[PDB]
Design a protein around this ligand. Structure first.
Ligand SMILES: C[C@H](O)[C@H](O)[C@@H](O)[C@@H](O)C=O
Ligand SMILES: C[C@H](O)[C@H](O)[C@@H](O)[C@@H](O)C=O
Ligand SMILES: C[C@H](O)[C@H](O)[C@@H](O)[C@@H](O)C=O
Ligand SMILES: C[C@H](O)[C@H](O)[C@@H](O)[C@@H](O)C=O
Ligand SMILES: [Mn+2]
Ligand SMILES: [Mn+2]
Ligand SMILES: [Mn+2]
Ligand SMILES: [Mn+2]
Ligand SMILES: [Mn+2]
Ligand SMILES: [Mn+2]
Ligand SMILES: [Mn+2]
Ligand SMILES: [Mn+2]
Lengths: 426, 421, 420, 426
C-alpha cells in the first residue's frame, strides 16, 4: 500500500461521525423521493475511470513548465503514483499507457500493475512528436503524411503499441494525431483524409478480435488551420469506414466554442460508435483542466445521456472512460483524485434522475418541468454517497485530506531526483 | 424590361473606356501567368446562383424592422424585383420560392417567371412558423414534434411544396426547420432525431425520380440549447439514411465560432452528399449579411474546394447554389446584386489557381508556397472579368450604379402602397 | 392577491413536513461547518431582483412568435402577472418599465403598483425601434445617428423616460441601444462614439441628484458588424466620461464566447462603475434563457464576486439587479419564478463560502483547495433555505407547484382574448 | 550582405520586365481613380515593422517542436538571419529582443546590429517562464504573485531589460506576462490586479523619460481560467493608471472569438493609449500564424483605422508596429518575409481608400457604397507597388524567390549544428 493503512483508517475515523449524519440525512431525503440510497452507492462503488500515466507528472504550456517536487522519473514511478489515486478513491483501477513514453518490459509492467493492484486500459500511440533515431519526421504529418514511408513508419508504430498492449492485458488502441495544416492550400483536405483512412485500415487489420480501435477528434492544436480528424462528423466517417471494432472517442475540450457536446454523445450512441470518453474541463480551448472544475453542469448532462442509455437497455454499450488532463499548477495526484471524484459525482447525480417523470414532461412538451426534473438530481449533494462508497471499499472519506496527512509527496520527493523548470512541453 | 435598355447601354458606354483598359491589362498579366482570360470570362458568365424570394424585401431582427420605400407587396412584386437583379448582373436567372409566403396559382407564377426571364430553383418549406388555420402549432417542433398528428401535418406541407415545385419547374425541396430545445431535458436528443428521420423518410417517398431533397443544418436559433439538425455530422447521417436523392445543404453562417467551413464542404463532397450552398457572410452568428462583405477570403476558400472537386474529376458533381441573406439596412436589390457579384468574384479567383503548381507544393509539403499559390489567385482583381461577362450578356458594367441611374426604387415606391398595419 | 391565500397555505402545508426535515438536516450540516443557517435565510429573504414588465409576455425570434394562452396585453395586464411572481417568490417586489411600450398615466401606474404590492425599478428607454408618427427613424442609429435632429429626438425621448420615472418612484434610467453597423466602412467607429458620448452627456444633465444613468453594452444584435457600446471596455469609458451618476450594466449573455464574465464584474466593482447586473443564461449568443438553466456554476461565480465585494466592504458598491430574459416556450410566469429562485440559490451558496479559508488558500497559492473551498459552498443544496425564506415571507414552498395548483393561467386565459 | 548583391540584381533583372508592365498598368488605373501611384510607393517604402528575434528560430506547440536545418544557436545568429529579412524586404530595419533569451554583451549586440544595418525596437521582458538558477519561480505569477519577494524579483528583471535596451538604442519596454489562474477561486481577481498595478508602478518609476511602457493583454494561455491583463478594457485601466508614458499593445490573436479588433484599435487611439501592434494571424486561438495568411481583410480593416487616424488629424500618433509570430512548419525567414510583405500590402490598400467619398457615404448612411468604397481599395492588387518599393530601396522584387536562389538556408545549415526534435516549447 502506497499509503499506510493506519493513516487511512485514522483519517476515516476522524470523519466517520459527520459522514454518518450526512449519509443518513441524504438517505432519508432520497427515501422521501422514492429512491433507495443503498442502490445508488452500490452502483457508484462500481463506476471506474482510467487515469493517464502522463497525467501524474506535472504538465506545461508552450511558454513554460513548472515541475513540482518528487516528479515521477519513469512509467514505474508513475504507476506508483497511480496506485495512490486508486487506493484513496477506488475509482481508478486502470491506467492508460502512452508509447514510446511508457516503453518498458511488458513483463515488468504487468508485474508492477498486479503488485500495485492496477490494470491497464487502452494503449496510446504517439505520432505527433519525433523520437531519437526516428527515420522519418512527423513534422508534416504521420498517418496522413504525403510520404508513403512516413505513413508506413506510423502504421508500424501503432502495431507495436498493440503488441505491447497484448502483453499487459490492454484491449484497445487510441489513435490521436496532430495531422493537419497551418495554412490554406498547404493540404488538400480530401487527399489527406484518404491517406489517413488507408493507413488506419492497415492498423485495423492488425487488431485482435477482442480489441477496439478508437479515433479521437480535435478541432485544432497542434494544427492551426485544418486538422484531418477535426470533429465528430469526420470521426464518425472514420469509424463507419474502418469497421465494427472502430469507434469514436469524445474528449470534452476538443470542440468548437458553444458546441452541444452531450448531443454528440447521444448521436454516437444512437449509431453505435461511442467508443468512450476523455474527461476534463475547459473554458477557452483544449485547456485540459480538472474535470468539473469549470462547468460541473455540463459534465452532469453528458452523464445524463450515458445513464439514459445505461437505462434503456442498450445491450451493446460499455464505453471506455478515461481522464485526459494536464496539471500545470497543482499536485497531479490531488487533481486526479478530485477529478475522478467529480466524475463519480456527476454519474451519481444522473442516477438520481426520475426517468419516468422526465419522459412524461418530454412527451408533454413541459420544458420547464423537464429541466427542473434534471436539476432536482443535479442539485443533490451526493458527496455522502461518494465518501461512503470509498470508505466501504477501502478508500478514504476525504481522499486529498488523507493524501496530505500521509505526507506522500514529501516522501517521494526525498526518493526522487530534483526537477528543473524549463520551456514549453507537456 | 424592368430597367430601360437605353439606361443600361448609356451607363455601359460611360464606363466602356476604363473597362477596356483594365480588362486588357489584366488579360496581359494573366497571359504572363499562363492563363487565358477569355477562358475565365467564358466560365464566369455561366456561373449562376439562385436568389431568394424572401431576400428582396427588407429584413429585420427580433428587436425591430425598418422597411424602406417600395417594399414588395407579394410574390409577384418580388419576382419583378428579382428580374432587376438578373437583368443587371445576369448571374441570377433562378428564384428560390418559400411556401406559404409565395403561395399562388402555379401557372401564374410560371407565366410571370417566363415573362421576366426567370426560372425557379429549389422549393423551400416552412414549418418554423404557424400559418392561419393550422390544426396543430409548431411551437414545440414540426417534423420531429412529439405529437404524431403534428408531424403528419408538417409532412403534408412539404408534399404540397413538392407539388407546387413540380408545376413551376423546380427540381428540389430544401428543408430547414427550427426543431430543437431551449432547456436541457426538454427533449430526448435521440428520440427527437428518430421522429425527424421517420418524417423525412415519408417526404422522401413523394420525390419525383429527378428530384433532390436537401436538409439544412444550423447550430442554433430559433432553438437556444439544442437543435435536431445542429451540424454537418447529423446532416450527413440524415442524407445517408434517406437515400441517394437526399443531400446536405451548407449555409455559411450556420456553424460554431471558428469552424473550418471549407473542410466540411470537402468532406461532404468526398462522400457525395453536398447538395448545395446558402451563401452569405457573418461575424458573430447567423448574421445573414451580404456575401463576402465580412470575410472575402473565406468565401474564396470555399470556392477553392468547389473548383478542386472539378479538378479531381468528381463525377456528377452539380451542387445547387443559392443566396440566403436578409437585408436590414440597405436596398435589398442593391445588396443582392453586389452579393451575387462577390460570389462570382470568389469563383473567378478560384479558377485562377495554378493547381499544377499547388499539387506540387502539397506533395512536397512546401506550406509557404502552397498558400502563396492560392494568394496569387485571390489577390487578383477580377472585377474587369465580371464586368465584361455582364457586358457581353446584356447586363451592366456597374450594376448598382446603373440601378440607381434608372430610378427603379423611386418608381416602385410610387407604385406600391406601404403596409399600414 | 392574484393567488388565493387559502391556496398558498394549502400548498405550503402539504409540503411543510418535508421542508422541516430538510431544513433541520441542512441546519445541522451547516452548524458542523461553523455556519448559522438562520443568518443565511435572513439575508436570502432580503435579496431582491427586478422583473422586466416585458418578461411576462411570450417572447419570440426573428423567425416566429408562439404566444401561449392568457397573454398579457399592455402594462396593466403585465403588472397583474408580475404580482404573481412577487407573491409566490417574494424576491421580485419591483418591476422595470419600458417606454413607450408601458406608456400610461403615471398616477394610474403608481396606484396599480401600490395595489399589487409592487414597486418600480430603473426606467428603460427605447430607440432601437420606430414608434408610429415618429419624425425620425432609428434605422441607422439613435443617440449616435449622423443626423443631429435624430440624436435630439432620441435625447428628448430619454429625458421623458426620466420624467415618467420620477413620478412613479424610479431612481435610474437604463440605456441600451442597437446603434452600430452591419458593414465595414458604414460607420466611423470614433465619430459615432463621439456622437453617442455627447448625446449621453445631455441625458446626464437631466438626472436628479439621487438618480443613476446605466449604459448597457452588447457585442452584437441588432448590429452584426460593429456596435457602438460593444463591450465593458467601451462601457467603462462611457461611465468614466459622463460622471459619478453614470455606471455600467452587465448583462450575462452580452459577451463574446468564452469571456470570463465574473472578472468583468470584479473589474467594474474595483473602479466603482458596476451599476447593475442583468440576469439570464445562454449557450450560443444572447439567448435570454432562464438564469442558471444552462450554466449554474457561472451564475454562482458571478455572485461569489458580488458577495466578496460586500464582505470586504467596497465603496460605491450598490448594484441594481434585474432579470433580463425572454420566454419563448414556457409559461413566462413560471420561468420568471424559477429564474428568480436560481438567482437566490446562487446568492445563498456564495454566502456559504468560507472567505477566511479561501483567502488563506489564495495567499498560499493552493489552487486545488481554493477551488474546492468555492465548491463546498456551491455543492450545498440550499433549496431548504430558499423555500423556508419564501414560506416565512408570505411565499410558496414550491412556487411553480402552487402557481399551477391555483390555476392562475387558465383564469387569465378566460379573461384575456387570444388572437384566435 | 547576408545575400550576395549579384544574386539580388540577377533575380531582380529576371523579373524587371514583368514588374514594369504591372506597375505602369496599376499606375494608369490609379490615375483614372485620381491617385498618384508615386505618392503611394513613397509612403510604402517608409513603412516599417519590427521583427521578433524569437521568430527566426522554428517554434513549436506543447505537443512538439520540429526544428528545421540551420537553426540559430543564439542571438547573434538570429540577428544575422533578421538581416536577411531586412535586406530583401527593406521593411524590417529593427529587431525586438527578448530577455533573458537574448542576453549578451549589449555592446556587442549593438556592434552586430550596426554592422548588419539593423536597429532595436522595444525590449521584451520574460517573467512567464523560469530561467536557470532563478531564485523565485513564476509558477503562480510574477508581477502579481502573492509573494512580495517574487514580485520584487520580476520588477528587478524588468529594470534590467531597461538597462540593456538603453545600451543598444531601444526606446520601449513591452510587458506581457502569463499571470492568472487555472481554477475558480485560485486567485482573488481584484487583489491580483492591485498587486500587478503596484509592481508596474515601480517599473514605470524606473522608466527613462524618453521611453514608453507597453502592457499587452491576452484572453488566455498560459492561464486557462482567468488572466490578470485579459483584455483591452483592463489594459486601458493599466495605461491610464500608470501615466503618459504607458500605453496599450494590441496583439491580433489575443482576443475572444468574433471580437471586433479594429474597433478596439480605434477606441485606444481616440483615448491616446494605443502604443502599438503585434501582427500575426489566427483562426482558433493565439495561433501566431503568418500575418494575413488566414484573414487578409481583417488585416486591412485594422490598417483602415490607422490610416483614418491620420486622415482625422490625430496628432502625436506613432504606434510601434511589430511582428509577433511563431513558425512551426515553414522556414522562419521566408514566413517573416511574406508576413512583412502582407503588412505593407494592407497598409498600401488602406492608403488607397477615398476618404472624402467614404465620409460622404457614412454621413448619408449609404452602408452599401461605404463598404464598397473600402472594397475598391482592398480589391486593388498593390503587389507592383510593394515590389517596386523593394527594388528602389535595395531589396528584391520577389523576396522569397531571391532568398531561395541565394541558397542561404543550405549555407547556414552547414555553418550551424544539427537540431533534434523533442517535446513542446516555443
Ligand atoms: C497525450 C494524449 O495523446 C493527448 O491528450 C491526446 O489524447 C489529445 O487529448 C491531445 O490533444
Ligand atoms: C428562410 C430560410 O428558410 C431560412 O433562412 C433558412 O434557410 C435558414 O438559413 C435559417 O436560418
Ligand atoms: C428589451 C431590453 O431593452 C433588452 O433586453 C436590452 O436590455 C438588451 O438586453 C437587448 O439585448
Ligand atoms: C514571446 C512574446 O513575449 C510573446 O509572443 C507575447 O508577446 C505574447 O504574444 C504571447 O502570447
Ligand atoms: Mn484526449
Ligand atoms: Mn486534449
Ligand atoms: Mn439557409
Ligand atoms: Mn440562416
Ligand atoms: Mn439587459
Ligand atoms: Mn440582451
Ligand atoms: Mn504579442
Ligand atoms: Mn501571443
Amino acid at each position: 500500500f502506497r499509503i499506510a493503512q493506519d493513516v487511512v483508517a485514522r483519517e476515516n475515523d476522524r470523519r466517520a461521525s459527520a459522514l454518518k449524519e450526512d449519509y443518513e440525512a441524504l438517505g432519508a431525503n432520497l427515501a422521501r423521493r422514492g429512491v433507495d440510497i443503498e442502490a445508488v452507492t452500490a452502483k457508484v462503488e462500481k463506476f471506474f475511470v482510467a487515469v493517464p500515466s502522463w497525467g501524474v507528472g506535472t504538465g506545461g504550456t508552450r511558454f513554460a513548465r513548472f515541475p513540482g517536487t518528487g516528479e515521477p522519473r519513469g512509467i514505474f514511478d508513475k504507476l506508483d503514483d497511480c496506485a495512490v489515486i486508486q487506493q484513496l478513491t477506488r475509482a481508478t483501477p486502470n491506467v492508460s499507457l502512452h508509447i514510446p513514453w511508457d516503453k518498458a518490459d511488458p513483463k515488468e509492467l504487468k508485474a508492477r500493475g498486479d503488485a500495485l493492484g492496477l490494470g491497464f486500459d487502452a494503449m496510446n500511440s504517439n505520432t505527433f512528436s519525433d523520437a531519437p533515431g526516428q527515420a522519418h519526421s512527423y513534422k508534416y504529418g504521420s498517418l496522413s503524411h504525403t510520404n508513403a514511408a512516413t505513413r508506413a513508419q506510423a502504421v508500424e508504430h501503432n502495431l507495436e503499441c498493440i503488441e505491447i498492449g497484448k502483453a499487459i492485458g490492454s484491449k484497445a488502441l487510441t489513435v490521436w494525431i496532430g495531422d493537419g495544416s497551418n495554412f490554406p492550400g498547404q493540404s488538400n483536405f480530401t487527399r489527406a483524409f484518404e491517406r489517413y483512412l488507408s493507413a488506419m485500415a492497415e492498423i485495423y487489420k492488425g487488431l485482435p478480435d477482442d480489441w477496439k480501435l478508437f479515433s479521437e477528434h480535435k478541432m485544432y492544436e497542434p494544427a492551426f488551420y485544418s486538422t484531418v480528424v477535426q470533429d465528430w462528423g469526420t470521426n464518425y466517417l472514420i469509424a463507419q469506414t474502418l469497421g465494427p471494432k472502430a469507434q469514436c472517442l469524445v474528449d470534452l475540450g476538443h470542440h468548437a466554442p458553444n458546441t452541444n457536446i452531450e448531443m454528440i454523445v447521444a448521436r454516437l450512441i444512437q449509431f453505435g460508435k461511442l467508443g468512450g470518453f476523455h474527461f476534463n474541463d475547459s473554458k477557452y480551448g483544449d485547456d485540459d483542466l480538472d474535470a468539473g472544475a469549470i462547468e460541473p453542469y455540463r459534465l452532469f448532462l453528458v452523464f445524463n445521456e450515458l445513464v439514459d442509455a445505461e437505462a434503456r437497455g442498450v445491450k451493446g454499450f460499455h464505453p471506455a472512460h478515461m481522464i485526459d488532463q494536464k496539471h500545470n499548477v497543482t499536485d497531479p495526484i490531488e487533481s486526479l483524485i478530485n477529478s475522478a471524484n467529480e466524475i463519480r459525482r456527476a454519474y451519481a447525480q444522473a442516477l438520481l434522475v426520475d426517468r419516468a417523470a422526465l419522459s412524461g414532461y418530454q412527451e408533454d412538451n413541459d420544458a420547464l418541468m423537464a429541466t427542473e426534473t434534471l436539476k432536482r438530481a443535479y442539485r443533490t449533494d451526493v458527496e455522502p454517497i461518494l465518501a461512503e462508497a470509498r470508505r466501504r471499499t477501502g478508500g478514504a472519506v476525504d481522499p486529498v485530506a488523507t493524501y496530505r496527512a500521509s505526507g506522500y509527496r514529501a516522501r517521494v520527493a526525498a526518493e526522487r531526483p530534483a526537477s528543473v523548470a524549463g520551456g514549453g512541453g507537456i
